[PDB]
Amino acid sequence: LTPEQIIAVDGAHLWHPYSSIGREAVSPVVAVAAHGAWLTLIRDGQPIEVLDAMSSWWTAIHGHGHPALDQALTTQLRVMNHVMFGGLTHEPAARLAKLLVDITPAGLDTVFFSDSGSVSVEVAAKMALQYWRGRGLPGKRRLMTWRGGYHGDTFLAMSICDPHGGMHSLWTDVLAAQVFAPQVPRDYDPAYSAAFEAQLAQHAGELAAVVVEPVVQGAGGMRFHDPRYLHDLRDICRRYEVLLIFDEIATGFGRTGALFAADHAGVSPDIMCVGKALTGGYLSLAATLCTADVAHTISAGAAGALMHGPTFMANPLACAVSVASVELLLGQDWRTRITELAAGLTAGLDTARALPAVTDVRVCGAIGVIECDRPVDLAVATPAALDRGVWLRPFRNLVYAMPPYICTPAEITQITSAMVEVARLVGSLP
Amino acid sequence: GLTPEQIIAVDGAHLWHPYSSIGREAVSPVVAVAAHGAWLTLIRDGQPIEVLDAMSSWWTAIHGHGHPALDQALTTQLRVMNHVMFGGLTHEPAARLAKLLVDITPAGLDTVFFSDSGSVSVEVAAKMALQYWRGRGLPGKRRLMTWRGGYHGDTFLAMSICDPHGGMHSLWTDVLAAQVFAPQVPRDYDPAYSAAFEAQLAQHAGELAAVVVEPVVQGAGGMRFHDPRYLHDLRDICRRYEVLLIFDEIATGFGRTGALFAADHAGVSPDIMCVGKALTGGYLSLAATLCTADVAHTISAGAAGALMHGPTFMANPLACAVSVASVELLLGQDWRTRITELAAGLTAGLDTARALPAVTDVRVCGAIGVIECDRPVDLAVATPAALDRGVWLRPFRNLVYAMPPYICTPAEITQITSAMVEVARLVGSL
Ligand SMILES: *Cc1c(COP(=O)(O)O)cnc(C)c1O
Ligand SMILES: *Cc1c(COP(=O)(O)O)cnc(C)c1O
Ligand SMILES: CNCc1ccc(Cn2cccn2)cc1
Numbered sequence: 001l002t003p004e005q006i007i008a009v010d011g012a013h014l015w016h017p018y019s020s021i022g023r024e025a026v027s028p029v030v031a032v033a034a035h036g037a038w039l040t041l042i043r044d045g046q047p048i049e050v051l052d053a054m055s056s057w058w059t060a061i062h063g064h065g066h067p068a069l070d071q072a073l074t075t076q077l078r079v080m081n082h083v084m085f086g087g088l089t090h091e092p093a094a095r096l097a098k099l100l101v102d103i104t105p106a107g108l109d110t111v112f113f114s115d116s117g118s119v120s121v122e123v124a125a126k127m128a129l130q131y132w133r134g135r136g137l138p139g140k141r142r143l144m145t146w147r148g149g150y151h152g153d154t155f156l157a158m159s160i161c162d163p164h165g166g167m168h169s170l171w172t173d174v175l176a177a178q179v180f181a182p183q184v185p186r187d188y189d190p191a192y193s194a195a196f197e198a199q200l201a202q203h204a205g206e207l208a209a210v211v212v213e214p215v216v217q218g219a220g221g222m223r224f225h226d227p228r229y230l231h232d233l234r235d236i237c238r239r240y241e242v243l244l245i246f247d248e249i250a251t252g253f254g255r256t257g258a259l260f261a262a263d264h265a266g267v268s269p270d271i272m273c274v275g276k277a278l279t280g281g282y283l284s285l286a287a288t289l290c291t292a293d294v295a296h297t298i299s300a301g302a303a304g305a306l307m308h309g310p311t312f313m314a315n316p317l318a319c320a321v322s323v324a325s326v327e328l329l330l331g332q333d334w335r336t337r338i339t340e341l342a343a344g345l346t347a348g349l350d351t352a353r354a355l356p357a358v359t360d361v362r363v364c365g366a367i368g369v370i371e372c373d374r375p376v377d378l379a380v381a382t383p384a385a386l387d388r389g390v391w392l393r394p395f396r397n398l399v400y401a402m403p404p405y406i407c408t409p410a411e412i413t414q415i416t417s418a419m420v421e422v423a424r425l426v427g428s429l430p
Numbered sequence: 431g432l433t434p435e436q437i438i439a440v441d442g443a444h445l446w447h448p449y450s451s452i453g454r455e456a457v458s459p460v461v462a463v464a465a466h467g468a469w470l471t472l473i474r475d476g477q478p479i480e481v482l483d484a485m486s487s488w489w490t491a492i493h494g495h496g497h498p499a500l501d502q503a504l505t506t507q508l509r510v511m512n513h514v515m516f517g518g519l520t521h522e523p524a525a526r527l528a529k530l531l532v533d534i535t536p537a538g539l540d541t542v543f544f545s546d547s548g549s550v551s552v553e554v555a556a557k558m559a560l561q562y563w564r565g566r567g568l569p570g571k572r573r574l575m576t577w578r579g580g581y582h583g584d585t586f587l588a589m590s591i592c593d594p595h596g597g598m599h600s601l602w603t604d605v606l607a608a609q610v611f612a613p614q615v616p617r618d619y620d621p622a623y624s625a626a627f628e629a630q631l632a633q634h635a636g637e638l639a640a641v642v643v644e645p646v647v648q649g650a651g652g653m654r655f656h657d658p659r660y661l662h663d664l665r666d667i668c669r670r671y672e673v674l675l676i677f678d679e680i681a682t683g684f685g686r687t688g689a690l691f692a693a694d695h696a697g698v699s700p701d702i703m704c705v706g707k708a709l710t711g712g713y714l715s716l717a718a719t720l721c722t723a724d725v726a727h728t729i730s731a732g733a734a735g736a737l738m739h740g741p742t743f744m745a746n747p748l749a750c751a752v753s754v755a756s757v758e759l760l761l762g763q764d765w766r767t768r769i770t771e772l773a774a775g776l777t778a779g780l781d782t783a784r785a786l787p788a789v790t791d792v793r794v795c796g797a798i799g800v801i802e803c804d805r806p807v808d809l810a811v812a813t814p815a816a817l818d819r820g821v822w823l824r825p826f827r828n829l830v831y832a833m834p835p836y837i838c839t840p841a842e843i844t845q846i847t848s849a850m851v852e853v854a855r856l857v858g859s860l
């Protein structure tokens with residue numbers, strides 16, 4: 001298919017994320033190649049090279065077409081594409097589970113693989129609810145979280161999305177009614193933790209778990225909070241016997257400057273979800289980890305087996321590329337790499353602070369954010385970014401980047417310059 | 431990795447398997463070290479043996495493992511573009527697959543929403559149905575109706591339409607969305623069943639968004655078959671009472687029941703349809719939810735807004751590319767004759783099971799062969815019995831069944847059915 005043919009088929013038949021099909025002002029851009037940190041897109045009938053500043057929704061940490069990851073896939077493809085995990089096991093699953101248990105916060109020694117982040121959150125919730133059924137306390141059936149959060153798009157995951165500002169707000173009437181603490185602040189305030197504890201204490205007998213994104217809340221607004229809050233949550237949850245679940249689907253694998261964001265606080269949750277960067281952006285995969293005690297208790301009493309089992313559970317292809325991606329991360333000085341990236345983002349975004357439509361500029365590891373005073377118009381932002389050789393995808397009032405770890409300092413500067421210019425056009429601005 | 435004994439050790443310590451109580455399962459996973467064509471290489475007593483994948487790896491590997499055309503499609507795509515985000519970008523594999531799917535599915539399904547798993551595609555179908563009625567200004571239409579014996583995945587909304595009387599999610603009924611269940615659909619056609627279904631639906635019509643069923647064959651809920659005429663009745667009932675019709679074809683799609691889609695046996699089209707499993711030929715996780723023009727347009731009518739769903743790996747180029755090849759390979763051969771031959775082989779090979787003391791029924795529909803027993807099938811007995819006969823079988827409940835790859839030769843089907851009969855014989859010796 002030519003790019004024009006692709007556009008025609010796409011307009012007629014393809015539903016895109018978070019959209020009203022046939023009603024979007026900004027049409028999809030055709031992508032025809034991806035190599036390293038760069039995408040080849042078609043614009044005005046011609047190929048242009050642009051930086052993947054979004055890492056393809058925060059997944060492509062080593063860039064595209066990395067030879068180690070490519071070859072891990074093709075090596076597994078030759079041996080065994082896939083077998084059912086119901087009754088069988090295999091080397092890629094074992095290798096990946098071993099790696100994940102070793103690098104995640106202490107105590108997480110059991111791994112349930114699934115095919116997507118939203119499913120891994122549903123699995124985490126199922127684990128927490130079934131845990132309490134195994135304990136003979138089935139009244140512990142609600143979840144608690146703080147506002148500003150996002151945990152995926154399946155119906156239980158939607159129930160812990162921010163109720164007012166979250167994308168799933170219109171569904172509140174049909175979702176499980178969960179417990180919400182106020183928005184966690186950026187700076188540490190002991191009063192916030194005290195109030196969280198008081199609220200949790202009131203509901204403890206009906207709460208299976210607290211579920212939060214640690215340190216960085218991504219899709220709900222790119223908000224950062226002090227890691228000390230996580231220390232407090234761990235303490236509160238321990239004292240009131242509520243399980244602690246960390247959703248690290250966005251924060252995992254070095255993105256915030258630590259291997260997992262939990263590590264900024266030295267905290268271990270009872271259950272943890274990972275995904276996105278897990279596969280280096282090649283294939284869909286996610287995992288839910290839990291402690292041995294959680295795993296055992298889930299089938300205690302009359303609770304029985306954990307009744308979940310995705311058809312493509314522990315897919316050899318996805319596991320094999322994930323193993324390579326994780327090993328590639330661990331085999332380099334990733335901490336210094338992310339520190340350099342953060343410094344580049346900070347330096348490059350500094351001039352945005354003085355722009356009239358900019359409310360805040362903030363950086364956490366390989367995450368750089370310009371918060372604006374109005375929603376960002378994609379019809380204006382997209383051409384401006386492409387004109388500068390950068391693929392950016394703003395949402396709400398945020399112009400942000402989560403670039404591949406392989407970006408050179410010059411590439412980071414190109415990205416930040418494009419971001420600054422997009423921000424200038426938000427408030428330029430007719 | 432890397433030896434089978436090392437794999438077993440890691441697996442035992444760290445890996446949760448589907449539908450199981452980790453650390454409490456009597457039958458350990460068998461190590462798989464390769465798969466090619468219709469065969470798996472499994473480790474039995476430290477030795478690698480080749481056995482037939484009679485299950486098609488949970489009903490996905492319709493062309494066998496490592497089919498050169500599907501391998502090639504994957505590697506070709508890998509060399510150009512592994513993945514880009516579908517939020518703002520489009521690409522050739524997504525367009526090619528969407529065009530194929532709209533062309534080969536029941537008439538009227540012209541819009542495709544890709545996702546990463548079958549369970550998610552069911553949640554998307556439900557979200558579409560609910561949002562459709564919100565767009566029509568009828569937010570009271572928010573429940574689902576189905577018949578008993580059904581299965582639709584493991585995420586929490588999908589669980590709500592699993593049969594709560596003995597279905598795998600039966601313990602959760604108290605916390606799931608309360609749906610409307612008609613009695614078990616009979617095998618033989620009885621107009622009285624449809625008349626009763628209609629009377630029940632009529633009472634709930636004002637609160638029903640959709641009827642959701644598996645057409646012709648109910649898989650995970652019990653390998654039950656029903657007359658396709660029932661689907662004709664459902665279409666008519668749904669039309670007359672203004673309730674959407676959703677067919678979950680995740681198990682029945684792509685030729686499995688002898689028609690390209692099971693709906694084709696009845697000559698009807700649903701308003702929304704889910705596909706998955708065999709979609710990728712069993713290489714990678716992918717699923718899709720299709721809907722009519724009316725559903726797509728309405729969903730964002732009446733101020734209902736965008737469809738707020740968007741999997742991170744939505745429309746993954748690798749998964750789409752191998753699916754295009756799988757679908758084209760199916761369409762480019764006389765698949766209908768192939769399935770007819772498979773059905774004849776299964777029927778001929780399973781006939782001797784009817785006389786066995788523990789066998790209550792033997793039934794075949796397309797490339798699906800089922801021996802139903804009068805007691806649960808002990809995996810500890812069935813597994814080595816089948817393996818010693820060169821066949822991988824995975825019974826569940828009281829069912830010894832096969833859904834073999836379409837590439838199975840008559841000799842291979844004879845081998846599969848012989849193993850099934852021996853398993854059934856062993857069941858009845860208690
Ligand atoms: C396999 C299947 C699903 C989806 O289950 P997953 O484990 O998510 O693949 C849904 N519906 C039916 C009828 C199925 O057979
Ligand atoms: C991306 C993400 C998810 C899962 O979303 P998917 O679209 O299913 O990948 C869940 N939680 C968080 C915090 C995420 O960033
Ligand atoms: C793989 N998830 C869907 C699915 C669920 C149950 C079944 C039947 N089964 C149950 C246990 C083993 N197989 C088949 C597919």
Ligand SMILES: CNCc1ccc(Cn2cccn2)cc1
Nearest residue numbers: 018057219394395517740741742
């Ligand atoms: C891809 N599903 C998770 C997810 C949801 C929202 C966002 C933020 N976003 C919303 C629109 C474009 N980006 C990022 C990841």
